[model samples]
Target: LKTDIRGMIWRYPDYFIVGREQCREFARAVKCDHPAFFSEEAAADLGYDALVAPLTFVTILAKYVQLDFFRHVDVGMQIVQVDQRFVFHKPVLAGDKLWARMDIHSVDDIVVTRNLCTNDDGELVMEAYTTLM
Candidate 1:
């Protein structure tokens, strides 16, 4: 379940403004069910009019995209999210064209069992550091 995922070069038109339906679908695919995730009022509480995708949606990229370094891990051992830090550079709208890039910042197998995933840019839109154990 590990591979060195190369950064994607997708344009904004294909990613910006992802809708609630898509988010929900991803959520369902990942078996995550948080009430606020589907609550319109909760979205408004967060200054949004509709449901927004969970931050974990990024995991989908690992499944769809191929990564060279990532493939080195033994089979049956997949990502075991230990810690996550997300900074919203901008609000993701229902149709905002988002541009993304990922880099394996580091891999640690000592004190902690984890890997770091960083979105390299002058300023990060979002970054996730995860581990596959």
Candidate 2:
């Protein structure tokens, strides 16, 4: 990818609410034993509004955001994830309606993206940075 990639920006159209079933699935896949992530009753007792997904679960939204990014570029060669970082503003809990704003920019053989993930009310969720080569 080239620097021209910087010209591209994307926003996910469907604002998604993380449902309990999906939340539990991620917890199971990750082998997470965190009670607040696996059960609503436990989550409520734990002081969360609902099942709270661990920070790593941001991948669910990241994947969807990247899908939209990939749609704008046609890559003839393999792209590898060389780096990534997620700074959490708040733990993402089940039932949160998340929104996304994605920005893409790159240099020779390297791609850089910044994604701002927010709640439906526009509160910060997390900020993700990724580098691909």
Candidate 3:
């Protein structure tokens, strides 16, 4: 049984989202080694680098906040990240601590759901709505 699962928002500097090198570094740190990484010029052509982080990178935020949520679920329960939506109103750059707030928007005996993480500055960085069965 878990209660009061609250997360504080984080702030990240603009430098984190402005340069090619930094993007590559962040991608690598997160193990996003695929050739289609936003750092790749081809990826940019596909409209990836235009955003602060690659869509897949958004998962890191959820994982960062819900460290315990997974372990506490009932045994044999299946926790699946069914879908996610990310909207980058502004770019996030290096030196930005990037704050995020997490809320469990819905939950039931068999499933848990939450909104994607949002920054303290009121930006909708990404929305991760998941269902665990």
Candidate 4:
């Protein structure tokens, strides 16, 4: 099932909205007990408009692409995760909607993906780099 999808275009059907509920759940899911993730006051004290999301909240984005991506594209039989890196430019606050587009950057027996994203303000939220075989 080896298919060369280098330079292939991938688009998300919709953007993910990260707010208090999602942030709170993700925080708790990761065993996070930070007040900034659950309290508006705590967040404000930390200089945020609303509760801020945890770093692991980015997994929501990864999962989104993971399900949508592999469902449509065929890699080989044995899979390998070469690397996965995510960098957030700014704190993702509640009420911010996030979306991303992935471009296949390079491939051989493995594929390197460059995923770039934006929030509701049309600002670049982060970049997620993933490699797989």
Q: Relative to the unseen true structure, what is the C-alpha lDDT of residue 126 in candidate 3, on a scale of 0 to 100?
A: 50
Per-residue lDDT, model 3, residue 86, is: 56
Q: Output the lDDT of residue 76, model 1.
A: 34
Kindly give the stretch of ten consecutive residues in candidate 2 with the minimal lDDT sum: 1-10
TM-score preference between candidates 1 and 4, better one? 4
Put down candidate 2 lDDT per residue, 9-117, tens digits, no spaces.
Answer: 7888878777778778878888988788887888889788788976677777887889877876766356789998899898788878888888875556787778888
TM-score for each model: 0.48, 0.85, 0.47, 0.84
lDDT of model number 3? 0.48
Models sorted by TM-score, best on top: 2, 4, 1, 3
- lDDT at 33, model 3: 61
Following a full C-alpha superposition, what root-mean-square deviation does model 2 have from the true structure? 2.1
Order of the predicted models by lDDT, top scorer first: 4, 2, 3, 1
Clashes of each: 18, 0, 21, 0
Listed per candidate, the RMSD to the true structure in angstroms reads 6.9, 2.1, 6.7, 2.1
List lDDT for all candidates, in order.
0.47, 0.79, 0.48, 0.80
lDDT, candidate 3, 1-133, per-residue tens: 2443223222222211234465666688878765655544655665554424544554555565555444443333235555555555554432234554445555444334454444456565555554544
TM-score of candidate 2 relative to the true fold: 0.85
lDDT of 4 at 78: 65
